[PDB]
Amino acid sequence: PFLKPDDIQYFDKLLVDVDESEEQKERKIMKLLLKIKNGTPPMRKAALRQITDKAREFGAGPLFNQILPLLMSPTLEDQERHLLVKVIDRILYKLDDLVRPYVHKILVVIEPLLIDEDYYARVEGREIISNLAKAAGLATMISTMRPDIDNMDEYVRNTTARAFAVVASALGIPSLLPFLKAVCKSKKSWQARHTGIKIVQQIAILMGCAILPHLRSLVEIIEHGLVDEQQKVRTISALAIAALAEAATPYGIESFDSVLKPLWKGIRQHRGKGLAAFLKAIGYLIPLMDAEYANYYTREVMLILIREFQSPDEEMKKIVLKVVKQCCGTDGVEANYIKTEILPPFFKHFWQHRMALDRRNYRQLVDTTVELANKVGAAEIISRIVDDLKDEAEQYRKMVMETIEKIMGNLGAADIDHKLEEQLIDGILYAFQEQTTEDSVMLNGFGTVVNALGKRVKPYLPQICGTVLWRLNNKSAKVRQQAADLISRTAVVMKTCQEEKLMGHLGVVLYEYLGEEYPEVLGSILGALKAIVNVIGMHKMTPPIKDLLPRLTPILKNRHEKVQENCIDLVGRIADRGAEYVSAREWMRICFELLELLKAHKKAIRRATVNTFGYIAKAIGPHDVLATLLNNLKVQERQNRVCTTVAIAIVAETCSPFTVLPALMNEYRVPELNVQNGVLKSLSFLFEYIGEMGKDYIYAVTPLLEDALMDRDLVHRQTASAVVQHMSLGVYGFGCEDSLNHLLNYVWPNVFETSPHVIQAVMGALEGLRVAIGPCRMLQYCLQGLFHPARKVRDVYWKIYNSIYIGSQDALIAHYPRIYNDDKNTYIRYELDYIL
Amino acid sequence: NRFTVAELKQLVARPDVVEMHDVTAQDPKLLVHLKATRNSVPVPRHWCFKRKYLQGKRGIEKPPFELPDFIKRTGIQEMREALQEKEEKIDIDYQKLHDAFFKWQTKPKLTIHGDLYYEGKEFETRLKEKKPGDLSDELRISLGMPVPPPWLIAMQRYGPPPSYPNLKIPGLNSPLYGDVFGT
Amino acid sequence: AKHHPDLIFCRKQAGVAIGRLCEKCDGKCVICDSYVRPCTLVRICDECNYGSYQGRCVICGGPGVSDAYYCKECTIQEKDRDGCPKIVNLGSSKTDLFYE
Amino acid sequence: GGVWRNTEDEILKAAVMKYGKNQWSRIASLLHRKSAKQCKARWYEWLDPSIKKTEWSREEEEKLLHLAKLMPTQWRTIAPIIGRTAAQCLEHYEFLLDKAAQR
Amino acid sequence: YFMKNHLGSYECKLCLTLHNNEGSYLAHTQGKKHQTNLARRAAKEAKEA
Amino acid sequence: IPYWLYKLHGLNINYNCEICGNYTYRGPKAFQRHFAEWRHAHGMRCLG
RNA sequence: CGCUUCUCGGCCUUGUAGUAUCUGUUCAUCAGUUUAAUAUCUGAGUCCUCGAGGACA
């Protein structure tokens, strides 16, 4: 597969056709890389495996020699990068002692993955450095990575710090401690100590909550940098304290203890970024102190906190913001003091159009404001920010809107007075009437506001729903779906207040849009109908179901991901609840239409589908519909079938399977194999759902499992084995064990194979058989296999014997046989032979 | 460091269960004691095989499965076959299926606790040891004798069989009802 | 599970944080990965639920809405008395789908 | 499509020998992979018993070299005249003669 | 030796293998020489040539 | 020359059964089947 | 004893992970490594001529 015009430089050796005459042939055959980089997806797959199994063969040297240039390529893609990352992982699951010379030679390319805009790139990078460090040795990593500490560029120092974070997560803090503790005391130059401290931080972020045990030692390291003559070291130091305390869940306060007294002092004398950093640290600290000591100390911090609102620094504003959250979100702080001193400057400087356009500042601002509401109360905050709902820009409106949302979510709408409530509803409608983008914030916002107001909202309905219909035209593509969803979430409120005319409106009006050709709208429409069904009942539906349901029936062709979803859902609600209003003929047509809905690429679609199919199975009764399931061609191998199997299960539940089984068991006869294993699955899920009731049917299924478990082809043994499992859990304790032993006979030979699905299947099988039969019989099959020095039987029988061993280890005692004692050892336990 | 098979068989009290792979274990005495237990089961025969106990039935195309009499006496199989022929409904009864599931319930042929599944387990339909004096019905039909089987007339002349010396067959030294003409 | 075989669980110490399930993974079991017979609720680890890691789904890892529960087949097989089955690793799933 | 596997080629040769030559619909109902026009094209291109699939000589090369200049297009007209009659071996031989004489 | 399956496929009785399509069973005629392995069964059924 | 077939079948293996008239076996399975055979039982009955 | 014709009858018109069965393919001598058994690294009179042949002990 083709070569980009640049990649020639790398792959030129492949171009020449000289062939068939040692190492040069290994580099030459190693161009399978090219097949991984560019080509068809299958070529990438097969190539990837082929190079995985050749790891031990080719060795890490030639590979990395032929890779690292590519992953270093200036023209590298996104995908190609990620794929080469994959091959590096998969080969590094194998090679262990081999990589030692290349470790640095790896990290140099990989460390740039840690600092990246892409998140998935970062989690990948952390993963592969974890695999590398754990793969190599500790001393390998340490002795490797020293010279990058004092490197002139700070880039490598930084990304190297995150590297030490990852490797420290791998091999644990205490192993790597003396290295660090040695580093931060290095007397050569400051840059080192700066690095090592940054390492402390990135360890704090990465490990997070798990820092807890070594917190003391870590602090004892870092403390000496706060007083250092250099500035950076001080700044990054206190920052690292911050990260610690933030991962320091409400405890280890005294471990930070000796750190405080300098910090507070510094709080006085500092100008610039370092100051803000200290404020960050102290900020995360205060929640960890005692409300008495933290009373004083807090009251001291509040002053500077006030004074420093006004700085243009955005780092500043972030810090002091989150600070205000923690300091003023303290239970030991008085409302009125905040109400006077803080709120007016807070809404003055902080609420502006510089903030909201940014992302982090947006969020953090939301949170802090939410908490201030949590203390001073509701009507204050909201009352001050309502007037901004009507502000021009979107993002700002979005901000105050979600703020109001969370506020009225927590505190409740009860505190709100009347006039401010008028400004509320008008604000929310007005903001909702202009929507540049589609998003939930405005909608969830409105819904939460109304559901919180309760029936105080009643005078406002006609304005609401007037807007709802007029908007319900305007633009279908953009706003139809949105006004529809608005109805959906406002259903219950439009119900409990007992406005019936409005339910007539929404009922037939929405009924009319079911002919809408745009799917993304229609979906929202059906959703709205759904929500309306859950408030007003069956027989009171203003569009009587006789009208509605057959009008729904043809829509199932619609392909669309949202239409199919909501549609099938609603057919489910009505098919489950009333179900009498519609004649059976319509129903069976619904069936023959439902059958091909199982091509859905989405799992929830199939979910609702099968459950519905059960409901209508109740509405009619088993035989016909289970026959219509058995009609299935099985045509698709990758699933698309076994959902029908699930329908066979649930159908067998909805009316007693005590009826249904003979039809199925007969339908195993058919020579077509894939449907044979199909009905095997049907038995599996069947027993999984029936549980206890299998105390009878075990016998019926027993000989057929004999026929199936006796192998035509592996899938028979597998699926049948799964059946044995779920049967074995289900029947437990009821006294049927005998036939389960018989079936265990035929289960037992299948123990040996390398196919993952059949071996894990058999494992589940013998586990369920363990609990059902009891360990004694198991162990009596597992004894002789232990001994076997043959590199197979011992592997397996010891795997089994372990599975039997972990559970029920208490009950095994009696069943260990008598084993005679040799020369040096006494192998007879004589306690059991004490006789009265 | 490892004892031979003859020394392990002479030391064991039950040498009819020792195998060739048990000498390569770490403790042959405990393995020989555990293999000679009362209600113990042996390991599967796929410990040394390389077919993974499921690849030997490649060309075998026998009946996929067989329904029981309690399902065949309900008429659901013929209705399902008619529905499959129409596609390529019935509503026969609702209490007859409950009667076939409860009253007309047939207990299936189970197996013993030591009856493990073999590799083939279909061509070795062994059954006790139908010996001298005891035969099956049909072969009576081929023989066609109304209720001795007539070559125990020649077991008069030529003598009692060398193969089963303990023999008695009716009317000769064994002084018989139904099928079984000798013990 | 049956969908992702290369995924590894957390298996950490059990805390007092009750587990939750996302709206896309609602009703699915954690160990058995089934939809029927819920018997025991899911408990999360202490490090697995802290700050932004609280209120997240165990299997899906997205925004959790309803509380997750374990299957009765996994409860009777003593598969629910193990550690916290939080999905930590995420490999060969939702990686190439972001590019398309 | 039209991979033209060997097991499909033997079945197409058996269908051409058993059913006939001027019945393309009868031969396409026993393969389940190609249509009748594709089966007739395969029978006229590779499954024909009179096709000379080998023995490329200098007389045929001189005949094709003294014909591509008189008619530059219409290689299908010179297919039966040159003697190859495969409608693709002539273009392949022309490409080989153009690549070998270029160096 | 050609036998039909219950799912629209062919299965070889003499070769004791599966056939994916109709061309697969039609290509195990010249190949899959199970006919030459029937000489032992022909000698066991009849001792004379 | 079926060298691989004789190696997989277990041919050219040193084995001898002294109970079966001091006969030699070319394999371990052949030595196990020759120890319980007609000639071995006849020699055991003639030995007493 | 052999051959040609004629008659009558017995009668055949998509993106990823993993798995197997089909079909082509074939299975220089000691010692240990390894493997269920298989393969393996290392090991082995003089002269002449082009591994082979001849001569001598």
Added chain:
RNA sequence: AUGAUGUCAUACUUAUCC
């Protein structure tokens, strides 16, 4: 008459996934 490996289709599983 199994088994061996290897080019090469074909089905199946993973409730695989936009």
